[PDB]
Design a protein around this ligand. Structure first.
Ligand code: HEM
Ligand code: HEM
Ligand code: AMY
Ligand code: AMY
Lengths: 49, 406, 100, 54, 442, 54, 59, 54
């Protein structure tokens, strides 16, 4: 049917060790984005130069 | 101080019944009921009701289609229009002081509709869908046809503009249909959460038409019609009826209790995967009574048959004076219950403030239903089995029988 | 001293758009308002206007005009669209004001 | 499309800017100016390209 | 008006030495409605325990041991009361509606279900195949499957992600036992609420409950209500394509705060501003709700609705729309864009209406008896007590533009949403795209 | 045409050395130019509309 | 906590972000150069004119 | 179109060859060669145009 459907396990498979249930994904990633962004922020920077 | 303030009714010099009832709710709702509907259409102008029912939001003389919609919304308003073959109710709802403002638009929507030839000529293509959605419900389909097969002339006219006329209704047929039915005598400025002195001081502006009964819908001749719609939906919908009962007609309440006296019987009388119920519609100068039976294809024959035998053997003495006590009570319930919701309620202080001009208290409305029982019912059923029957049907049907096969 | 009436008459024949045989309104550039205006036009007047324009074009495209007879006379010029157009505008100005 | 004059990515452009392009019936010479302007752009680019050869 | 609110009868509440909390509201009304609202749900189910709460709801009526089937119904029918109910993810209830002249009779009935259900092993093996069919029906209601799938991916891995209905394999194998294992485990007074509204006199209620709910808590456990395992929100997507369908559905959302949170107000006001559309309406002229307007002008969607479905400690603030295979994109774009606008440059004149619009649903949320009980039933259970319309009023009668901005942005700006979409969605762009649709190129 | 000529003028006045006979003529046309554009046109513009009740 | 402090304050508002790219670039420049220049020159002690400029300016 | 990225004659081209362009998911570096070839065409035209300056 459709109830029989699940989002498979992406845990270790991918997922940063700040994401493995039992605790808000929020508060956590609103830190992670900084990083991935940090890079970009930098690349942009490096590029400017 | 207890929240009781007797619902005052004051029939204006026109015929415009003004019913209020300050119940102290934060959100009050005003409503203009009318004796209009799709019963007053001729072979032509058909569906002009329906369309009209939609032209609700079309520019008036006191406020533009724009102003009106954003006007009502800038208050957390809600304008909508519920209609039936023989009556259109224009409600509106809000709260506090905003009731006053919410009015300007309801006033204009019902009396100063200047249905502009473009707006409508640009609104008509809505019928195609408004109807298309409603028709996803097989039930509405069978019924539309039932009334067709139950009558012949006014009333038997469809509730949802027929296809062929989707874009032929004229901006005129709209005024003409209003000028003839939206007249003081056949209107009612009902309302809740309001002081009556205020709800009255509004009927003063609402005084813009008099013509008692402008076009009066022809009496409804009965017919033993039968119209099947082969469409294979894996499950058949069927309805059968025998003209009868009219609103105000003392012979009414009887079926109601027979409506309940019936049900546990027809259902518990037909084993397997299905559904079946007692059908009852009370119209101004007529009504209907029967039973619709949503049932699987091949098991459609059996289902209706058994459902019928039951309405049959119900007339031939299979009704304990107990069945009546129980059923007599359920109505007491369904009545009272479906009055909790100020909209299903404002629907009651209205219907009456329109057809009569009175207000039967919950006390006597009971004393009247309480009033009859054993005395009728068994007999109300009999009326069904004898008179002429008109069936309606949608579904594979290949296994469903015809009235000539009882 | 000098009638605006007397004047308009001037300009009208001066503009000479009636030499092509089309009403004033048949000329107003077609902006958002006018379009909506014209889109509100009764089908009668629409087809009328159309032809008048196509005729106008056809003339213009031939460099030749309409016989002195067929020119339309100032007093007989039919402001067939001004009325719709106006509602439009105010309809808008009403909306534009409300959105503030 | 059996057309081709419309079924070819390039070829369409042409049969869409030189053929089949809807243009007003009534148009004075003052409308040629532009097609001319082109011919100049050309005559200029052609001649000058050639003059740059020396 | 404000006086109308104030003159609104306070709601009475008092718990038992048992645990149940008994509350309700009184009016003149002959009729009424009453019910027990359990803090039970699917969320409280396991990998092999999933379904029960439902399979249950489905036998919660077919009788008790005191009075088997034919009789309960016959006793219910016969008195003209309507016993209906549901079971969500963190909320289940069972309410009846009689003439108030039955408080003590309805109440008993209630108790006799939440405590003693026949669970006739022969009744079960039928309701088993009934659900398995009834489930196969829930299925083509794309209007829903699209939400479960939303949950499914939005809260992937945790308890919420499991659909209230439960897998076919469980419903195909739940044991006479497991059901009871569910009942006896969650159906307890401390987590149950007896609420009602109509013409009832609290005390009479109390005593009847206090009378038919003769529960007795020994241990400290029995008197304690377990707090649930936190569910990890997981910005992601789940696509169940099928161009074979009339149209596609799309539902995207950000994590919700949880009932408790005071912001759910301002937030609620948010959703008021973009609201919902649905081709039957009558408004290409609609109120600000551009999503609505634009939805009309450019014929964007068949229907769209904004929702802040929240729970105990988490939530799902988003929007859901239905649209032709073809205009899916333009819609998202325009829509998702609105969120931005909403929390980047929203105006007072806007919030003004929003509020009143909420204050209208705020009121009409409580329209009748059944509904009122709902809130009471709910209020207590999730909030702790009852929130008076006089309160909600202030709560949201004090939300300014700058407050909405501050809020929505706080839960929408540059957040990783969860999207769900069944149907011919070939047109819906990948994630990154609908993701970078979360920040406005300010 | 007052403009088109006002242009053909500026031109002549351009191919002409700077002395009183010119110069002034210059800055003059070199004034009508602007005005004719920035001001005259739009004025004669609305004006003509009113000579039509617009 | 740097990264978090950063995001919220610097990378969140597309308005801000950019602003730090700029002020950042200015810093990266100034620093990258001096560093580079040094790394370079040092890898060539006494070979550059800056380094012999002195036998007509001492060292 | 509220889009703009699609309602603008020029602007569309871009949001139709750099954004919104459907490209196969699976594509090796051997697919960059071309976008690179461009950058060359540029680097060549830019530098050479500049070298021709002398
Ligand atoms: C856009 C159209 C062009 C304009 C407006 C234009 C105009 C001129 C003008 C007025 C001169 C001076 C001619 C003279 O001494 O009287 C000139 C010279 C020249 N142009 Fe062009 N030119 C154009 C395009 C080209 C092109 C496309 C090339 C080649 C890329 C080109 C190459 C030259 C050369 C070789 C000269 C030098 C010899 C000469 O003075 O006649 N021109 N061009
Ligand atoms: C299509 C890409 C181009 C190719 C394949 C290309 C290639 C070359 C090559 C290989 C040379 C000889 C360089 C050497 O001595 O090693 C050259 C020279 C030159 N190219 Fe290009 N070129 C290109 C485009 C341009 C452009 C667009 C211009 C300007 C219109 C240009 C202007 C020159 C100049 C100034 C020279 C002479 C100075 C020199 O030899 O370096 N080149 N180009
Ligand atoms: C491979 C060849 C493709 C054809 C390209 C060529 C194409 O647009 O050819 C015509 C339509 C274009 N003018 C017109 O269409 C046109 C339009 C309205 C009226 C008239 N006539 C007046 O009575 C016209 O003539 C005219 O102005 O040339 C342009 C501009 C272009 O060519 C230019 O880029 C060339 C430059 C870039 C070198
Ligand atoms: C105003 C700017 C408009 C943009 C123009 C610019 C535009 O086509 O940009 C890309 C799409 C083009 N390559 C691709 O689309 C592309 C296609 C499939 C895969 C990949 N990647 C591999 O993994 C691609 O990269 C790339 O080859 O440049 C061309 C060719 C063009 O530009 C050239 O005319 C410029 C020359 C004429 C100077």
């Amino acid at each position: 049917s459709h109830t029989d459907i699940k989002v498979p396990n992406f845990s270790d498979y991918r997922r940063p060790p700040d994401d493995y249930s039992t605790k808000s994904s929020r508060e956590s990633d609103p830190s992670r984005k900084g990083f991935s962004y940090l890079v970009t922020a930098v690349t942009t920077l490096g590029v400017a130069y | 101080p207890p929240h009781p303030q007797d619902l005052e009714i004051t029939k204006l010099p026109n015929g415009l019944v003004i019913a209020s009832l300050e119940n102290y709710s934060p959100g009050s709702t005003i409503g203009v009921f009318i004796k209009a509907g799709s019963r007053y259409e001729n072979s032509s102008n058909l569906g002009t009701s329906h369309l009209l029912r939609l032209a609700s939001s079309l520019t008036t003389k006191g406020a533009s289609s724009f102003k009106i919609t954003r006007g009502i919304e800038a208050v957390g308003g809600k304008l909508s229009v519920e209609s039936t073959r023989e009556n259109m109710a224009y409600t509106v709802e809000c709260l506090r002081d905003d009731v006053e403002i919410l009015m300007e638009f309801l006033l204009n929507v019902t009396t100063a509709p200047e249905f502009r030839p473009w707006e409508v000529a640009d609104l008509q293509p809505q019928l195609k869908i408004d109807k298309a959605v409603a028709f996803q419900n097989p039930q509405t389909h069978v019924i539309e046809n039932l009334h067709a097969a139950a009558y012949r002339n006014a009333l038997a006219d469809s509730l949802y503009c027929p296809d062929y006329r989707i874009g032929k209704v004229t901006s005129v047929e709209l005024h003409d249909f209003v000028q003839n039915h939206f007249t003081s005598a056949r209107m009612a400025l009902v309302g809740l959460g309001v002081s009556h002195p205020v709800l009255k001081n509004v009927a003063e502006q609402l005084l813009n038409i008099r013509g008692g009964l402008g076009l009066s819908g022809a009496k409804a001749k009965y017919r033993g019609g039968e119209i099947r719609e082969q469409n294979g939906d894996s499950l058949v919908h069927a309805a059968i009826v025998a003209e009868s009962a009219a609103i105000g007609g003392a012979e009414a309440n009887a079926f109601s209790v027979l409506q309940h006296v019936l049900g546990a019987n027809p259902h518990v009388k037909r084993g397997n995967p299905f559904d079946v119920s007692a059908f009852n519609a009370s119209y101004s100068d007529s009504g209907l009574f029967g039973f619709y039976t949503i049932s699987q294809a091949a098991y459609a024959g059996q289902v209706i048959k058994a459902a019928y035998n039951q309405v049959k053997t119900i007339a031939q003495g299979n009704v304990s004076n107990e069945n009546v006590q129980a059923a007599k009570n359920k109505l007491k319930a369904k009545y009272l219950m479906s009055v909790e919701s100020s909209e299903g309620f404002l629907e009651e202080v209205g219907s009456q403030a329109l057809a009569a001009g009175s207000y039967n208290p919950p006390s006597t409305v009971l004393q009247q239903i309480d009033a009859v029982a054993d005395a009728d019912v068994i007999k109300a059923a009999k009326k069904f089995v004898s008179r002429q029957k008109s069936m309606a049907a949608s579904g594979n049907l290949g296994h469903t029988p015809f009235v000539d096969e009882l | 001293s000098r009638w605006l009436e007397g004047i308009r008459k001037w300009y009208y024949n001066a503009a000479g758009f009636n030499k092509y045989g089309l009403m004033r309104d048949d000329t107003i550039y077609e902006n958002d308002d006018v379009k909506e205006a014209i889109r509100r036009l009764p089908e009668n007047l629409y087809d009328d206007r159309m032809f008048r324009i196509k005729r106008a074009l056809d003339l213009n495209m031939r460099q030749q005009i309409l016989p002195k007879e067929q020119w339309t006379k100032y007093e007989e010029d039919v402001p067939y669209l001004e009325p719709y157009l106006k509602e439009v505008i105010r309809e808008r100005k009403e909306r534009e004001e409300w959105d503030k | 499309a059996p057309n081709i004059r419309k079924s070819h990515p390039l070829l369409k452009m042409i049969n869409n800017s030189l053929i089949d392009l809807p243009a007003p019936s009534n148009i004075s010479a003052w409308w040629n100016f532009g097609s001319l302007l082109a011919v100049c752009l050309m005559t200029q680019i052609l001649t000058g390209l050639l003059l740059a050869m020396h | 008006y404000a006086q109308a609110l104030q003159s609104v009868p306070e709601t009475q509440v008092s718990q038992l030495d048992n645990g149940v909390r008994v509350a309700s509201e009184q009016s003149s009304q002959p009729t009424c409605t009453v019910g027990v609202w359990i803090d039970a749900g699917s969320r409280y189910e396991s990998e092999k325990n999933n379904g029960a709460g439902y399979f249950l709801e489905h036998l919660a009526f077919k009788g008790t041991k005191n009075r088997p089937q034919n009789a309960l119904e016959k006793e219910v029918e016969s008195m003209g009361a309507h016993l209906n109910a549901y079971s969500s993810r963190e909320h289940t209830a069972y309410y009846i509606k009689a003439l108030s002249k039955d408080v003590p009779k309805a109440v008993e009935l209630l108790a006799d279900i939440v405590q003693n259900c026949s669970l006739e092993d022969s009744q079960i093996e039928k309701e088993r195949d009934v659900i398995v069919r009834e489930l196969q029906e829930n299925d083509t209601s794309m209007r829903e499957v699209v939400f479960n799938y939303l949950h499914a991916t939005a809260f992937q891995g945790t308890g919420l992600a499991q659909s209230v209905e439960g897998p076919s394999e469980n419903i195909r194998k739940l044991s006479r036992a497991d059901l009871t294992e569910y009942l006896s485990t969650h159906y307890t007074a401390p987590r149950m609420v007896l609420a009602a509204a109509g013409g009832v006199e609290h005390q009479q209620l109390l005593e009847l409950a206090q009378k038919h709910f003769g529960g007795v808590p020994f241990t400290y456990d029995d008197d304690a209500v377990p707090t649930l395992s936190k569910c990890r929100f997981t910005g992601s997507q789940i696509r169940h394509r099928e161009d074979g369908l009339p149209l596609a559905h799309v539902a995207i959302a950000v994590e919700g705060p949880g009932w408790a949170h005071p912001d759910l107000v301002a937030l609620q006001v948010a959703n008021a501003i973009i609201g919902h559309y649905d081709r039957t309406y009558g408004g290409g002229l609609h109120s600000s709700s551009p999503l609505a307007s634009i939805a009309v002008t450019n014929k964007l969607c068949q229907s769209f609705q904004t929702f802040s479905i929240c729970y105990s400690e988490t939530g799902l603030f988003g929007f859901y729309f239905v649209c032709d295979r073809m205009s899916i994109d333009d819609m998202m774009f325009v829509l998702q864009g609105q969120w931005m606008r909403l929390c980047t440059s929203i105006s007072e004149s806007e919030v003004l209406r929003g509020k009143n619009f909420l204050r209208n649903a705020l009121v009409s949320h409580l329209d009748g008896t059944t509904p009122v009980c709902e809130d009471i039933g709910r209020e207590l259970l999730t909030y702790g007590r009852r929130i008076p319309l006089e309160e909600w009023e202030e709560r949201l009668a004090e939300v300014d533009a700058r407050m909405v901005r501050e809020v929505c942005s706080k839960y929408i700006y540059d957040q990783c949403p969860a999207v769900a979409g069944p149907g011919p969605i070939e047109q819906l762009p990948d994630y990154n795209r609908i993701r970078s649709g979360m920040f406005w190129l300010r | 045409w007052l403009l088109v000529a006002n242009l053909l003028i500026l031109t002549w006045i351009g191919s002409q050395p700077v002395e009183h006979p010119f110069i002034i003529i210059g800055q003059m046309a070199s004034l009508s130019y602007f005005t004719i554009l920035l001001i005259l046109f739009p004025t004669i513009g609305t004006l003509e509309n009113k000579m039509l009740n617009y | 906590t740097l990264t978090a402090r950063l995001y919220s304050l610097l990378f969140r508002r597309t308005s801000t972000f950019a602003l730090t790219i700029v002020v950042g670039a200015l810093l990266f420049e100034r620093a990258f150069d001096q560093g580079a220049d040094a790394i370079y020159e040092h890898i060539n002690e006494g070979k550059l004119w800056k380094h012999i400029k002195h036998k007509y300016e001492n060292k």
